[PDB]
Amino acid sequence: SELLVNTKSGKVMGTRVPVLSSHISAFLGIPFAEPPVGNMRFRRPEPKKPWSGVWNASTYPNNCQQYVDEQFPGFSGSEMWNPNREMSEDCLYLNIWVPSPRPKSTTVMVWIYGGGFYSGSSTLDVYNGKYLAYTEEVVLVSLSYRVGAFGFLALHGSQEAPGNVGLLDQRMALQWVHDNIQFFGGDPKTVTIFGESAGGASVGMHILSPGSRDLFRRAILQSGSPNCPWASVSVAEGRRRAVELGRNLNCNLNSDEELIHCLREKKPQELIDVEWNVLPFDSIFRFSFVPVIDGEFFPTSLESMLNSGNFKKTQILLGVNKDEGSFFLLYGAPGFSKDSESKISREDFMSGVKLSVPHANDLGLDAVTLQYTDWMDDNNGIKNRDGLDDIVGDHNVICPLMHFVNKYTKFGNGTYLYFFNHRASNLVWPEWMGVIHGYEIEFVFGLPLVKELNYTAEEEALSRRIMHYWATFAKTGNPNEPHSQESKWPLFTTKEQKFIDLNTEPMKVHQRLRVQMCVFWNQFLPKLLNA
Amino acid sequence: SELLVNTKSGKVMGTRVPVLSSHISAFLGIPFAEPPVGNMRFRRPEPKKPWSGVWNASTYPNNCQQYVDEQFPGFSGSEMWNPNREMSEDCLYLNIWVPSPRPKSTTVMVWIYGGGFYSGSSTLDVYNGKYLAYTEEVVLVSLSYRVGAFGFLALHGSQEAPGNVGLLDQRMALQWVHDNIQFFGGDPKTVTIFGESAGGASVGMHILSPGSRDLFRRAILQSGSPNCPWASVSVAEGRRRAVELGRNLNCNLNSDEELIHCLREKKPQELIDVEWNVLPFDSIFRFSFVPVIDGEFFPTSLESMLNSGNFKKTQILLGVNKDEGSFFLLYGAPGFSKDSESKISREDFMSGVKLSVPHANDLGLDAVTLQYTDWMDDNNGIKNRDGLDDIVGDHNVICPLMHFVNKYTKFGNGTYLYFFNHRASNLVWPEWMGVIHGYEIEFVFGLPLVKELNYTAEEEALSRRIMHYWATFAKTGNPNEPHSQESKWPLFTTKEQKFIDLNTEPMKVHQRLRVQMCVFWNQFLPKLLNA
Ligand code: IUM
Ligand code: IUM
Numbered sequence A, B: 001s002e003l004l005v006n007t008k009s010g011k012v013m014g015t016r017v018p019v020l021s022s023h024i025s026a027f028l029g030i031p032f033a034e035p036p037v038g039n040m041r042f043r044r045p046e047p048k049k050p051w052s053g054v055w056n057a058s059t060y061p062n063n064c065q066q067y068v069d070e071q072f073p074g075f076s077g078s079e080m081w082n083p084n085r086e087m088s089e090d091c092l093y094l095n096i097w098v099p100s101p102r103p104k105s106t107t108v109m110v111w112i113y114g115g116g117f118y119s120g121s122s123t124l125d126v127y128n129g130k131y132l133a134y135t136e137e138v139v140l141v142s143l144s145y146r147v148g149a150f151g152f153l154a155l156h157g158s159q160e161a162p163g164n165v166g167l168l169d170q171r172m173a174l175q176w177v178h179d180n181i182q183f184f185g186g187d188p189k190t191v192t193i194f195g196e197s198a199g200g201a202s203v204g205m206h207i208l209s210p211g212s213r214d215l216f217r218r219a220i221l222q223s224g225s226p227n228c229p230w231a232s233v234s235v236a237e238g239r240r241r242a243v244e245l246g247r248n249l250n251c252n253l254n255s256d257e258e259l260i261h262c263l264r265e266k267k268p269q270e271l272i273d274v275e276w277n278v279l280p281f282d283s284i285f286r287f288s289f290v291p292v293i294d295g296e297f298f299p300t301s302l303e304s305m306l307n308s309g310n311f312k313k314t315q316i317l318l319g320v321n322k323d324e325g326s327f328f329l330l331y332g333a334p335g336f337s338k339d340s341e342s343k344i345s346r347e348d349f350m351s352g353v354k355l356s357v358p359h360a361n362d363l364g365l366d367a368v369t370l371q372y373t374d375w376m377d378d379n380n381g382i383k384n385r386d387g388l389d390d391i392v393g394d395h396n397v398i399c400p401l402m403h404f405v406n407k408y409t410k411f412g413n414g415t416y417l418y419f420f421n422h423r424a425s426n427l428v429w430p431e432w433m434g435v436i437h438g439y440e441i442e443f444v445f446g447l448p449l450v451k452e453l454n455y456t457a458e459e460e461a462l463s464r465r466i467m468h469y470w471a472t473f474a475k476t477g478n479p480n481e482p483h484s485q486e487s488k489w490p491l492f493t494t495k496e497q498k499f500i501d502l503n504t505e506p507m508k509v510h511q512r513l514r515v516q517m518c519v520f521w522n523q524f525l526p527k528l529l530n531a
C-alpha cells in the first residue's frame, strides 16, 4: 500500500520522505543479517531470520562501531563523515529509497560507503538517496557493513574470525537486494553497485570475488579499486595485526581460540581505541583491518586475478578526484594544518613521502622524490605541498585505479573513466586541499539540488549531469543517453585511454590519466622494490 | 727577428700568416718531445733534446696515428675532424700563433683537442689560432698528444706501457709552454688551457693531476670534464682492454713484457684497425683507450679528489652544447641516419638507451626510460629521437660536467658556465642533430669571421663575443670586461647555479642547467646501480 512492502523476510513499512517538490518512499533500517553481536562478533554474517509482523522501516539504523573523527570537532567538513546515528555492533541494515509511485522493475543502485574499511555509515546526510532516487527514478539502496576490526579482523585459520567478514556483510546485503528488491519495484537483473574509497575498493572486490559476481550487473568505482595498496593485506599480515590488536588489549594470545575469545569480551570501544596501534608502519592512507587476500573471498592474489581476467566481466564506470591525497596529508602528515596554506618545507616533504610510501626503502623513497620534486625549485612550499598530495593520490588511488582500469578493460564489456576536478563553491575545507577525496559524493547524491545547501547553479547543473551519467550508466551500461544533446563520454579503451573531466566547464576528453606518474607507481617502483 | 725565436730548445723560425686584414706570426710543428716511436711507443714522453740550428716552424706537424672517420667520405661535416696532415707516430709537436708585432708578455691559450682520446689533431682548420690570436691578441698554442692505444694503452704494472701517456704528452707540451712561451711573447704566469670533449676532459685532468696544476693558470672546459663516464677506466679495465687489444693482434699475452713487445712490432694501423674491438660493451660514446685512474697521474679516484677539494683551485669557464648526444647517435645508434629526420621508433629507442647506458641493468635502463620517455606520446619518433640525444648528452657530458662544476665550485676561485645552443647557419649536418658536440669550436676559434665561410653577421657577432669571453677570461679569470656595455656573465655559485646562453639572441641567464635530469644521472641512477 505504497509504504507496505511484503518481502521474503517479512513485511516492511516505510515512510514518505519529502524530496525537492515531491515525496518518495523510504525504507530505512531493513535488517539483512542477524546482528553480529556476542558470539557472532567477527563471524561471517548470518542471514536475517524472517520476522513476524511489520518491520518499522522508517528510521535510520544504528551505525556500526567505528573510529569517530574528533580531529576537528564541530567542523562540518569532518563531522559530515562521522557516524550520525547511535553506534552499535547491531548495524547490519540496509536503506531503500523508492520513487512515488512505485516503479515496477526499474534500476537499482546499491551504495557501498567508504571510510578506509574502519569507518562509514549508510546514514550520513551525503548518502541520502532521496535526491538520486527522485531525480533519476532509480531504486537506491544504501547498505551497511562491519568496518574496522569488527568487519575485517582476520585470523585466517579460525572459523570464528576469518577476515573479509565485513565484505561478506556487503555480499549479504547484495543477496537480500537480489532476492527482495523486486518487491520495492527494483529490477534485480540490473542492480549497479557503486561506492567510493573503500566503498569502490569493495565494489571492485565483488567484481573479483566469484561469490559476488552474480549478485549485481554493473559497477561504479569512485576513488578506489580492489588493488589499492591500502585495501588488502595478506592473510599473514592480517594475522599479525589481529594478534597485535590482542596484544594491545592484554589478551592471552596463546591460541586463536584464546585471542578471539578475549577480543569477543572487550567492549567495542576498546577495540576501536587501540585499532590504529597495529599498523606495521608509520604511514598515511593505511588502515588496520582491511580485506584479507585469503583464498576464499579472493581465490588468489588480486594481480593474478586481474591478469587472468578472473573477474566479473561487465561495464564499469570509475574515476578519481584531482586531489585525492590532501585529506590524508592534513590528518597525518606533518606541516599540513587545516587553517594554513600548508606550504610544506623540504624536511616535511621527506617526512611526507616517507609516510606516503611506508613500504619503500631509501632507494624507493629517492625514486619517489626524484619523480615528484620540482628540482628547479625544490624548496617551494606550494610545490612540495601539492606534490605530496600527488604522491599520496597517485600511489594510493589514482595509479592503482588506472592499473585496474587497464587490466580490467582487456576483458570487460565497457569502461567509462571520469576525472572529477571540481572544487565545490561551498567547500568548507581549505583551498589548498583541492578537489578532495570524497567530495564528488555530494554531487553523485544530488546535494547541489537542495537550495538551502548554497551550491551554485552551475554546480546543481553538474550534479544533475553526474546523477544522470550515473543512473543512465546503471540502467544501460553506458552513461550517455542515446543520441542526446550532451557530448558523449568516450569509452575507455586500452588503445586511446580516453577519459572525461567532470566539472562545470563543459566536458573535455583527455588521454592517459596521470600516465607518466602511474608508469612510475604501477611499473617502475614495484620492480625497484623487488630488486 | 719577429719570426726568429730563440728558445731553450733551440732556435725556431716561423712564418707570417695572413689573417683577416693583417698578418700574424705562426710557429708550426715545434717538437716538444722526442718522437715516441720504436722502443718508445707507449712510453712516457721524453723531453725533446735541444736542436742545433734553426727549426723550420713553418709547416703543420704530422698528426698522430688515429682512427680515420670514413663514415661519410667527402662530407665536410665529418672530414673537418679527420687528420688533415700525414699521420705518424712522430707527432709530439705544438703550434704557436703570435701577434704582430710580438707582444712582450701577453696571455697564452693552450688548445687541447678532443676526439674521445682516440682521435684529434692540432692542425685541423677549425683549430687554427690565427683568428683568435689576431682578434684577441693572445699567444695561442695548439698541442698534440698521442691518442688511442698509442697514448692510452695501460698495462698498469709495466714501465713500458703505463697508461695516461697521452696525458703526459699534454703535460710536456704544457711544460714546454711554461718554459719557452716567454720567448714568443707569452706570459707563462697566465696560460689558460682550454679544450673540448676529451680535450676538456683532459683540461679537467690537469686541474686534478698534482703533476700538472703548476703548469697553467686557468682552464676552459668545452663539453667535457675529467669525471665524464667515457674519459677514464680503472687500471684493471685498462689492463683488460690492453690484453684484448693484444689478443686481437694474436700477441702472445703470457706476460706484460711479451704483450708490449708484440704491440710494439705491429704497424700503427693494425692497432687502429682492431682498436674498437676491445670495448667491453655494445655502447655509444665509449672509447677504447682513455686515461687510467692509476695512482700516479690521478692520486686516487676522481670522485674522492673532487670531494676532498684535491684539485688545482683556480677559475674555470666551462659549458656544454645543447645537443651533445646527436653526434654519437648518428654514428652508433640504429635508426639515426644523416639523410633522414631520424624519427626513432620505440624499438630503436630501447636499443639506443641500452647503447647509451651500457653499464646499466634492466632496472637502470627502465629508470632511464622512465625519465626520458614522453609517456603521453611514447611512440612519437621526434620525441624518441631528441630524448636519445638528451640521454646521451646528459649522461655523457652535461650531467658529469654539472657534477664537476658543483664539486669544483665548492673550492675554486670562480666558475663561469655557458650553454651553447646556437645552430650554425651554415651547418652541414642535418637539422635534427641540433647544436652538435664540437660545433661551438668554430665560434671559439673565430671562423664566423672569415667571410668566405658563409656565416651570418649575427654569427660573426657571436664568435667575437665568445672569443672575447674566452680570451678575457684567459687574461683575467673573468670573461667579462670590467664595466662594459655587454651584460655580465654571472658567476656560477652553488647557491644560485647561474649560467648563460651563448647564441646570437642577446645573453639570457638561467639557473640549474638540466638539474632534474642531472639529479637522475648524478645522484639517483648510481645509487640504483650500486643496489
Ligand atoms: O569463543 U571461541 O574458539
Ligand atoms: O595532489 U594535486 O594538483
Ligand code: IUM
Residues within 6 Å of the ligand: B160, B256, B257, B258, B260, B261, B264
Ligand atoms: O720491448 U719490453 O719489457
Ligand code: IUM
Residues within 6 Å of the ligand: B322, B323, B324, B325, B326, B386, B387, B388, B389, B390, B391, B393, B434
Ligand atoms: O639531446 U636535445 O633538445
